[PDB]
RNA sequence: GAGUUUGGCGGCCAUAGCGGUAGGGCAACUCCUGUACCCAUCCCGAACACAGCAGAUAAGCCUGCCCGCGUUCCUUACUGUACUGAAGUGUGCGAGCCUUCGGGAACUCUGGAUCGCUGCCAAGCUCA
RNA sequence: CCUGGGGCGGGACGCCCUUGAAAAGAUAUCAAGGGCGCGCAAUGGUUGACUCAAGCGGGUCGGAAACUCGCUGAAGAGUGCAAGAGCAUAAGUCAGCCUGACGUUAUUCAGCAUAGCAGUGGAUGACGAGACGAAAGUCGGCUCUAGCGAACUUUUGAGCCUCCUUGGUGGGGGCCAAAAAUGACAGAAAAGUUACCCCGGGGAUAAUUGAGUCGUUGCCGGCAAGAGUACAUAUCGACCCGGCAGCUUGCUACCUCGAUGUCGGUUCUUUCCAUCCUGGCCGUGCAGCAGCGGCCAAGGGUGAGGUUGUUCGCCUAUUAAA
RNA sequence: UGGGGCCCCGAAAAUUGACGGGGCUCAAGUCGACCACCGAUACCACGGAGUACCGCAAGGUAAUCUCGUAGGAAGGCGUUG
RNA sequence: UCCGCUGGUUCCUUCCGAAACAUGUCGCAGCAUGACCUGACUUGAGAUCGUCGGUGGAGUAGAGCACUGAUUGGCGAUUCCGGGGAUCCCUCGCUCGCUUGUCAAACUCCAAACCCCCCGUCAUCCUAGAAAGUCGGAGUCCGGACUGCUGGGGUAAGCUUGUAGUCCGUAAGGGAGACAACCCAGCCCGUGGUUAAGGUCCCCAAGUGUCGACUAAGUGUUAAUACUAAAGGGCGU
């Protein structure tokens, strides 16, 4: 709303409402690569991003779309998919050589048992070192997909297929 | 200003955070057997006594609140540099 | 009468331009300088920690070490060499 | 108290009235004379000072009074438009003891004008150019500076 | 090639202008130096424009100045024989033409002094309280520095 | 292997803002549908969160355009003006001002442009 | 002690901000605007969640004064208190949990540019323990810059050292830290008077003459507003503006403190002219008489008395005028 | 009518006095330019003294050495024993 | 006796040569510490008084009104808060905008010239010793002036208090009538020459110089200047 020469417009990423620069400053002071976990309504995405004066650089990247080749047919936008994507991201980053980072959830609310923390647990369980406290993780049953009992009978196959996708994703990086 | 009577802080002796009770420090009576008291009695004679005939000076507008922090575990107190307040109470 | 505080005569020295007020770009806070590098001292008023004296505003210092987040600079002040500590938010590399 | 006291400009401005106390109000009442809602006056002459000086509000009021009287008498009540362009913004002060704590008390206001700066502008018809010229000549006699009249609009309409 | 001749003395001069004069080796009035046309020397000469006269010097004037006022270490007078011994040029006119053309240097004369201590100007100069553009002698004479250099021989 | 669409993180932080107009979604994003659950409301599943078969490009987002205000840059006039570094046996009764050499605006004006540029990665795709 | 002499007044006598201050830094005055000698267990730390002021529209005697809804709103609010600076997914507001308003310790800044100087204060670290938080982080109080004090002494805290041949008791002495104040704030335990005064100095500093200045004083000028039964200019001359003199009083501190003898009068001499009379003129709202105004002119004259030290002024009777 | 140069009025002070004085008028004034000359211990040349630094010495270098209050430093003269 | 106060303190030359300022001080006619002068030694390779280009700091001049406040009318609206003599029967000041006219030490959307730090460059100095260090001896902390900064204060002051440069102080000689500090010039001794500032009618060395005009007032015959009269007017020219 540029009223005049004395008006101050925010940064572009702040105008778009996509970044918190105070949090970003707090995260950059680590001098560690950020494990950037973002989720849309239909899938979840994880990145390993290091800062540069010219702009952020990404080291590793896993999306929910990559799980479907390993034998996953459930929804990509729930806890099991988020955990599996986190596991794949951690294993891929270990293959690349990068093995440390801090969790960057950005503007996403921090809620125990969230998809973000399921992806975080998947990253942790792959050996990828990242500071955290276990109380924010989802229960292991709902990482397996016990919410399938809610309304859908077809969702009842989520635990065994989650185990199968997990074992195949481990095998790809074994 | 109010300070809690009991709060958790660092004990320099046990080297941990324990509950500590705050106690106001009362100035003691000067001993008559200290070297300055003996010197005053020795310099007492006829005439001016030097520094022992000085009258005590004034006062600052507010004095510091002399507080002492005794650990509830080791029962040892330590005293820190203290604030300067007109009215001081303990929060109970 | 006139005082002798650090913030003496700092009305415009420690002021920001109109369209740079607010949260500063965070890239300036995570820049690294090598030993012996020449950096300018351009104090950011919004970053109130690790700020050198305004007397050293506009001076180029040589990096001589690091003391945590801050950098130790050798800054010439008149005819003396002063050791100035600064967070990178107030620093800026010299360009050749 | 002669105008030669607060006439020369040797100093910085003194105008921020929130950092001072008690300024006497200005004597100049109006700044627009004649027919204020007329703009189609073909001839427009102005009085420009030719030195950097300070004009007190009383001098401005005296010049304005004399010029307005001459214009109203000659061209009529609405045969002219007259504008006093400058406002007295400077605060004049005086030291009223000796030189100890000599920073003065506010005694009046003055306009700090520059060389070639317009003081008064008069707009009239073609036939009243000499009357406006004469009125502005009388106004400049009340001012602490040498002045000169210039024709701003309608130079070809007079000669 | 600049010809720089000092025409005003040292009393009441700012230390920056006086230090510029010293870096140009102009410590006394009527002393002349020859410096190249690069921007460093141009700015230095612009710094001292109110105490010197300068301009572009031609080969003939350089030849006369070298023959009449060139000196060697020990205060010996430059001659043609020394020029032919210590340079590839036969005479002083050819050497001066080479120096003006930039294909030789006054430092290519061994033991030659960089300062030429000139005579006072015969019949006076235009005056040291006005510039060349005001009818005086101070400042930029352009190619007309050779007139003043000729009258100071 | 080159480019594109979309997504994520960014750099510079209005040349990017405010406003208006016309087009798009196969994937992606999104709005959108619910509240068994993890999580939530000083009340409200509005938000946050979780789980998502449909509907939808009306919004966000993207692409095109518009000089409208704001901004930024150029151009002409103002103008080498204002101011100013150095020097001066130049000058004013005075407050002052001038000449020479060197720097040099701001505002406004004439006419233009500016309705962001850009780095890393990923995924769909378009290949010889 | 400072001080446009001193004194009275005040404190520019400690600390902090803006301007002065001339776009690095420094920079004086009894320079300008001022402020501080505190307040707060929350008005503090952290996390989460939110966004403020003010307008516009909607909503019931809930009034254009409440509370609530929507829109606009980079901040026009709030942040304890001066000023300036900082802050909006916050440095603001509310809520959850908390006490880092932590013990010890090293540097470097800045008070005190450059460039020595203290008690301190403030930045960055280390050691040891924590609070909040997924983590990153943040926290050495309250966004940054004021809210304070040497040595000696006492008292208080923790553990130690020590007291004269040796061991012990009581009592002393010491080390590190905290409290108590010196505000004339880099710290004396501190009222006057001298015309009865003394000494050393000072024109580094006042009374007086002299120099400068001229606000004030005296005397003028420009424009002429108007008044003058009409008519600005016979006469008077408002407002504003520009001067001269140095004969009033101030300002100032250049000369004089190893002395330039005060005021007034008296006596005698002289000068200036801005002329009171005497001479010559011009105007008139000049019949004459006599006025009023102005111009030239400094040759001569300009006196006697009552009060008062007076200067000045008042008064008396002469006088061409006094 | 406007803009300019010079002059005039405005313009009165105290011992007789100040363009330095005499005096000066198409100037011996003012303005714009110009020409020649005079005129320092400056500058140049020669000779001489001292100084600084270098050099075993002989000597070399000095455009970049030669004013000076408070004051520091070095070497000498003189008096009496 | 003591005094921080006054007076005096005795031979020559040579080399170098200040400070009249800051902080603390019962400190203000004193002293300490530092800046500044001088002497010696150690060390051993750079330094920066100047230029040019570049990376940075600008918030002064000027400018402007975009913030904070001032400020002048005209025009249009706030069916809002309110001045004037039962349907508040109708009159209207502020307030908010679009144009007009003005401003600012302690306003800034802008924004110089100087200047400052750093890099490179040239230039100068430097192994006949850079920068740095250590030690010996001091004086000094009454300053003053000119040119600028419209510096601040003041009616002003040969006033007072700042600042940059340069002087006198402590600076001869030459020139301004004389002139602490204005111009030339910094000055070992002697001689010769040529100039500088300034001057050339006589006093008085050199022009009764040249060209083109002006002035009729002895105006003037006065760089800076504490040593030089204004506003206003003139059919003087
Ligand atoms: K006085
Ligand atoms: K404004
Ligand atoms: Mg006193
Ligand atoms: Mg008696
Ligand atoms: Mg005596
Ligand atoms: Mg001496
Ligand atoms: Mg002394
Ligand atoms: Mg200005
Ligand atoms: Mg001088
Ligand atoms: Mg002396
Ligand atoms: Mg001198
Ligand atoms: Mg002399
Ligand atoms: Zn304990």
């Amino acid at each position: 709303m540029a009223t005049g020469p004395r008006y101050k417009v925010p940064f572009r990423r702040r105008r778009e409402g996509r970044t918190n620069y105070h949090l970003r400053l707090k995260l950059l002071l680590s001098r560690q690569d950020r494990v950037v976990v973002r989720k849309s309504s239909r899938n979840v995405q994880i990145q390993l991003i290091a800062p540069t004066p010219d702009g952020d650089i990404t080291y590793s990247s896993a999306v929910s779309n990559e799980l479907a080749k390993y034998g996953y047919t459930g929804a990509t936008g729930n806890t099991t998919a988020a955990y599996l994507t986190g596991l794949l991201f951690g294993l891929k980053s270990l293959q690349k050589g990068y093995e440390g980072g801090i969790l960057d959830i950005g503007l996403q609310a921090s809620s125990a048992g969230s998809r973000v923390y399921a992806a975080l647990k998947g990253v942790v369980d792959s050996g990828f070192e990242i500071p955290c406290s276990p109380e924010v993780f989802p229960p292991d049953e709902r990482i397996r997909g016990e919410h399938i009992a809610g309304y859908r009978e077809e969702s009842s196959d989520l635990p065994e297929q989650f185990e199968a996708t997990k074992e195949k994703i481990f095998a790809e990086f074994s | 200003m109010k300070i809690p009577k009991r709060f958790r802080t660092y004990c320099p002796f046990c080297k941990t955070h324990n509950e500590v009770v705050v106690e106001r420090v009362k100035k003691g009576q000067a001993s008559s057997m200290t070297h300055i008291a003996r010197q005053k009695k020795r310099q007492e004679g006829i005439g001016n006594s030097g520094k022992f005939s000085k009258v005590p000076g004034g006062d600052k507008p507010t004095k510091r609140i002399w507080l002492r922090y005794r650990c509830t575990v080791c029962k040892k107190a330590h005293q820190r540099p203290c604030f300067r307040a007109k009215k001081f109470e303990f929060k109970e | 009468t006139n005082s002798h505080g650090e913030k003496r005569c700092t009305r415009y020295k420690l002021q920001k331009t109109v369209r740079e007020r607010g949260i500063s770009p965070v890239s300036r806070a995570i820049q690294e300088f090598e030993e012996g590098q020449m950096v300018h001292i351009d104090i950011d008023p919004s970053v109130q920690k690790g700020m050198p004296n305004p007397k050293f505003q506009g001076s180029t210092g040589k990096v001589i070490g690091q003391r945590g987040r801050s950098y130790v600079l050798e800054v010439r002040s008149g005819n003396a060499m002063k050791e100035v500590f600064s967070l990178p938010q107030h620093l800026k590399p010299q360009k050749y | 108290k002669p105008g030669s006291m607060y006439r020369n400009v040797r100093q910085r401005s003194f105008t921020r009235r929130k950092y001072m106390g008690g300024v006497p109000g200005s004597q100049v009442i109006h700044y627009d004379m004649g027919d204020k809602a007329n703009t189609s006056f073909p001839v427009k002459i102005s009085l420009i000072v030719e030195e950097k000086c300070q004009i007190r509000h009383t001098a401005l009021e005296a010049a304005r009074i004399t010029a307005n009287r001459h214009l109203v008498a000659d061209t009529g009540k609405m045969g002219f438009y007259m504008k006093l362009r400058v406002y007295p913004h400077e605060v004049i002060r005086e030291n009223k003891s000796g030189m100890r704590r000599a920073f003065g008390k506010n005694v009046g206001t003055a306009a700090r004008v520059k060389p070639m700066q317009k003081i008064f502008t008069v707009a009239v018809e073609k036939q009243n150019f000499k009357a406006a010229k004469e009125a502005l000549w009388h106004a400049g006699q009340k001012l602490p500076t040498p002045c000169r009249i210039v024709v701003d609009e309608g130079a070809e309409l007079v000669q | 090639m600049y010809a720089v001749v000092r025409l005003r003395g040292q009393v009441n001069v700012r230390y920056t202008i006086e230090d510029t004069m010293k870096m140009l080796r102009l410590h006394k009035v009527n002393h002349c130096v020859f410096v190249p046309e690069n921007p460093h020397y141009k700015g230095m000469v612009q710094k001292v424009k109110d105490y010197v006269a300068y301009g572009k010097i031609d080969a003939k004037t350089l030849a006369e100045v070298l023959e009449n006022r060139g000196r060697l270490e020990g205060d010996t007078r430059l001659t043609e024989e020394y020029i032919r011994e210590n340079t590839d040029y036969d005479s002083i006119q050819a050497f001066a033409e080479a120096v003006i053309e930039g294909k030789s240097s006054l430092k290519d004369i061994p033991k030659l002094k960089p300062v030429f201590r000139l005579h006072p100007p015969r019949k006076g100069h235009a005056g040291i309280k006005r510039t060349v553009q005001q009818g005086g002698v101070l400042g930029n004479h352009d190619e007309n520095i050779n007139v003043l250099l000729h009258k100071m021989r």
Side-chain angles (χ1 to χ4, degrees):
Chain A
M1 183 65 167
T3 69
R6 194 188 174 187
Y7 191 84
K8 150 85 171 187
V9 308
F11 295 159
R12 176 181 55 71
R13 296 281 294 177
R14 179 57 186 93
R15 291 196 309 268
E16 304 176 351
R18 297 188 157 281
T19 188
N20 181 14
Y21 274 102
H22 316 270
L23 159 63
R24 173 171 180 81
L25 167 64
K26 288 171 183 291
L27 296 168
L28 297 186
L29 292 177
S30 310
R31 316 316 283 258
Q32 313 179 25
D33 302 322
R34 329 194 323 275
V35 169
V36 183
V37 180
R38 296 301 182 270
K39 64 182 182 62
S40 64
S41 56
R42 286 293 180 259
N43 44 38
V44 70
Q45 162 191 12
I46 308 176
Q47 295 182 298
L48 186 60
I49 300 184
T52 293
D54 214 345
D56 279 0
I57 59 173
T58 296
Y59 290 148
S60 303
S61 180
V63 302
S64 305
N65 306 129
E66 299 186 11
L67 305 184
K69 87 181 201 65
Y70 292 92
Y72 179 75
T73 73
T76 56
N78 54 16
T79 306
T80 65
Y83 179 86
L84 280 185
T85 300
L87 191 60
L88 179 60
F89 170 80
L91 290 170
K92 196 182 311 174
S93 307
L94 284 175
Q95 161 81 42
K96 200 172 291 290
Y98 298 104
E99 84 289 12
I102 63 177
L103 180 56
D104 184 12
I105 78 178
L107 298 173
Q108 299 160 326
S110 173
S111 303
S114 183
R115 291 160 59 192
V116 163
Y117 288 135
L120 164 68
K121 171 169 173 53
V123 180
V124 173
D125 290 359
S126 61
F128 190 80
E129 211 77 20
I130 176 175
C132 64
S133 185
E135 288 82 324
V136 295
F137 289 164
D140 203 354
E141 65 267 16
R142 82 171 295 135
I143 284 173
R144 308 195 76 89
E146 191 262 354
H147 70 83
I148 65 187
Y151 286 156
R152 291 90 58 83
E153 57 91 12
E154 69 281 31
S155 302
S156 52
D157 64 341
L158 271 293
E160 69 267 19
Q161 62 181 354
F162 153 74
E163 191 68 24
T165 300
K166 189 167 174 295
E167 67 94 17
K168 292 191 190 64
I169 295 170
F170 266 99
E172 174 68 11
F173 295 88
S174 58
Chain B
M1 77 170 303
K2 296 190 308 301
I3 198 182
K5 185 66 172 179
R6 289 177 170 71
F7 62 91
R8 182 173 169 273
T9 197
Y10 179 73
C11 181
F13 316 113
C14 58
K15 290 178 171 51
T16 52
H17 287 85
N18 298 108
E19 195 80 348
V20 304
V21 63
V22 194
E23 47 193 20
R24 198 85 172 268
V25 181
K26 303 307 178 300
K27 172 166 52 185
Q29 189 78 238
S31 167
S32 294
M33 292 188 275
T34 59
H35 76 267
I36 203 58
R38 311 198 303 258
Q39 183 186 356
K40 176 192 177 70
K41 172 70 204 314
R42 183 166 66 257
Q43 281 204 11
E44 287 320 318
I46 56 179
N48 187 254
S49 298
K51 74 178 175 183
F52 298 114
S53 47
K54 281 192 180 71
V55 63
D59 307 322
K60 302 296 285 190
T62 60
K63 293 172 177 50
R64 295 181 171 98
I65 303 299
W66 201 1
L67 300 176
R68 181 171 57 230
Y69 301 88
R70 188 170 302 281
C71 181
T72 58
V73 175
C74 59
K75 289 306 177 300
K76 292 180 179 179
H78 73 278
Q79 57 201 8
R80 301 179 292 187
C82 56
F83 39 82
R84 205 194 298 267
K86 287 274 191 65
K87 177 261 189 185
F88 172 78
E89 294 285 337
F90 276 121
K91 171 68 179 300
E92 304 297 347
Chain C
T1 176
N2 195 0
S3 55
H4 314 116
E6 180 185 3
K7 297 302 204 62
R8 257 188 298 100
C9 202
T10 47
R11 172 162 180 165
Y12 300 105
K13 240 179 178 183
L14 295 174
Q15 194 174 141
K16 309 183 82 172
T17 76
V18 298
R19 79 165 51 182
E20 84 180 352
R21 66 176 182 269
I23 179 71
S24 297
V26 306
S27 59
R28 200 183 183 189
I30 65 171
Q31 47 190 354
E32 63 271 13
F33 307 109
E34 304 297 353
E35 171 84 16
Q37 185 174 0
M38 309 309 296
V39 308
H40 305 303
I41 306 183
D42 197 359
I43 293 174
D44 184 12
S46 73
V47 187
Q48 298 176 323
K49 291 182 72 70
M51 175 192 308
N53 209 13
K55 75 187 290 177
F56 308 113
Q57 163 75 16
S59 298
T60 293
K62 174 168 50 56
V63 185
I64 68 174
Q66 199 163 11
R67 185 81 78 68
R69 299 250 192 74
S70 75
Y71 283 99
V72 193
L73 310 174
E74 200 70 19
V75 182
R76 164 86 64 67
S77 64
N79 288 325
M81 271 302 177
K82 299 283 179 54
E83 277 207 4
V84 180
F85 291 75
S86 182
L87 290 172
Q89 292 88 315
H90 313 292
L91 299 184
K92 193 168 45 184
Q94 175 169 340
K95 299 205 296 290
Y96 306 93
Chain D
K1 289 297 176 175
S4 63
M5 294 170 62
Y6 320 105
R7 191 268 174 207
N8 307 296
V9 178
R10 316 201 198 208
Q11 300 171 356
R12 68 197 183 298
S13 305
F14 188 59
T15 75
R16 313 300 300 285
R17 301 163 88 94
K18 68 182 291 294
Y19 302 103
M20 59 188 65
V23 187
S26 70
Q27 301 291 325
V28 54
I29 307 309
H30 301 104
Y31 294 79
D32 299 69
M33 277 69 60
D35 195 74
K36 300 140 60 183
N38 186 358
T39 68
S40 299
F41 273 135
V43 169
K44 292 181 181 179
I45 74 172
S46 66
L47 187 82
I48 66 175
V49 305
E50 62 191 6
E51 287 194 355
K52 189 169 71 172
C53 67
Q54 287 184 159
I55 310 173
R56 292 154 62 189
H57 59 114
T58 53
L60 289 170
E61 178 59 8
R64 191 195 68 76
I65 292 296
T66 180
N68 177 81
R69 285 181 296 180
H70 281 288
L71 285 170
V72 172
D74 294 317
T75 71
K77 191 178 185 303
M78 290 291 176
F80 70 99
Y81 173 69
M82 185 185 179
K83 173 70 177 178
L84 172 53
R85 293 173 162 263
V86 301
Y87 186 89
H89 286 295
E90 293 289 333
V91 173
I92 291 303
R93 50 179 198 256
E94 176 184 340
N95 175 29
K96 298 166 176 291
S97 44
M99 213 51 44
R100 150 176 293 176
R101 280 304 283 268
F103 191 89
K105 282 75 185 178
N106 310 326
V107 297
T109 44
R112 182 175 295 194
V113 299
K114 290 171 187 163
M116 300 296 88
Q117 176 169 358
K118 301 177 178 298
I119 305 300
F120 291 100
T121 299
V122 174
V124 291
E125 293 282 346
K126 172 195 310 179
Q127 64 267 18
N128 291 319
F129 167 68
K130 302 194 185 307
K133 195 166 179 174
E134 195 260 337
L136 290 182
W137 180 84
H138 287 275
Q141 301 286 321
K142 308 296 200 303
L143 303 182
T145 307
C147 311
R148 75 165 88 246
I149 296 90
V150 182
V151 179
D152 314 332
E153 306 297 353
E156 78 286 348
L157 263 55
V158 291
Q159 282 185 354
Chain E
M1 196 77 172
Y2 276 139
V4 184
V5 61
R6 179 167 186 160
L7 292 170
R8 295 181 69 188
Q10 68 166 18
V11 192
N12 297 315
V13 185
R14 326 174 66 95
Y15 69 96
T16 49
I17 305 174
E18 186 66 52
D19 285 321
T20 316
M21 302 289 316
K22 288 185 174 60
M23 295 198 212
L24 293 168
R25 301 192 185 282
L26 300 173
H27 294 88
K28 299 162 179 46
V29 307
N30 295 331
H31 286 195
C32 174
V33 295
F34 307 102
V35 294
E37 298 282 40
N38 50 42
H40 304 275
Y41 270 119
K42 177 166 174 290
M44 296 187 73
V45 171
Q46 177 66 242
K47 189 88 178 312
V48 301
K49 50 162 180 57
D50 301 300
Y51 297 90
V52 309
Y54 63 96
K56 284 181 47 57
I57 187 179
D58 57 4
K60 175 265 166 196
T61 312
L62 183 56
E64 72 173 1
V65 177
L66 275 181
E67 181 161 7
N68 299 345
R69 298 292 179 183
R71 298 289 185 266
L72 308 168
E73 197 198 46
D75 198 74
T76 301
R77 302 195 185 187
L78 190 80
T79 52
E80 303 279 354
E81 308 308 325
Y82 186 89
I83 293 291
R84 75 187 65 265
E85 300 312 333
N86 302 265
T87 60
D88 296 330
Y89 302 91
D90 191 28
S91 66
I92 288 185
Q93 182 71 56
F95 175 81
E97 296 172 345
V99 170
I100 291 306
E101 284 163 302
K103 59 186 197 293
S104 181
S105 169
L106 286 179
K107 294 175 178 177
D108 300 1
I109 308 290
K111 286 284 149 286
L112 183 71
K113 285 177 165 49
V115 173
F116 294 79
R117 303 177 303 106
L118 299 179
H119 207 265
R122 295 146 187 74
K123 304 176 69 174
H125 55 57
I128 56 170
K129 295 196 183 307
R130 300 167 79 179
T131 64
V132 174
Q133 296 83 26
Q134 296 164 333
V137 75
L138 299 173
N140 194 355
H141 287 246
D142 278 319
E143 279 71 359
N144 274 327
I145 196 60
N146 308 281
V147 180
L148 179 66
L149 284 181
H150 177 60
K151 79 164 52 66
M152 306 174 58
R153 59 188 184 275

